[PDB]
């Protein structure tokens with residue numbers, strides 16, 4: 241039950257479809273699904289506190305959060321939001337998001353550490369669920 245690691249993605253499903261629901265430019269949608277754009281994910285967890293760094297070819301972003309305390313981040317398409325993470329079970333957390341301005345699809349994400357050492361991420365926009373799977377490196 242410690243999410244800490246350097247995680248490499250091995251499986252993705254429905255990501256392009258998620259970006260389409262979010263209104264992302266098709267130009268970026270095709271780029272985003274390219275093997276080149278795969279995100280490296282670094283997580284450091286201590287207690288209820290999480291540090292997560294995501295890196296791609298030209299972008300690196302960091303978020304810090306504590307379970308139960310509201311924080312600000314961005315939706316997958318980059319719109320600022322307020323987020324609140326809570327546990328669903330011993331090994332899975334769930335985050336609900338609220339836009340800071342304007343309106344758009346209802347977005348959320350989950351992270352789950354399996355008993356076989358994989359990290360499963362889901363990201364949802366309205367009715368579309370994208371699922372990603374990572375392993376430690």
Ligand SMILES: *C/C=C(C)/C=C/C1=C(C)CCCC1(C)C
Nearest residue numbers: 255272273277278279294296299
């Ligand atoms: C599965 C998630 C991605 C491929 C994300 C890609 C990505 C970032 C993580 C940062 C913004 C650029 C973009 C390539 C969309």
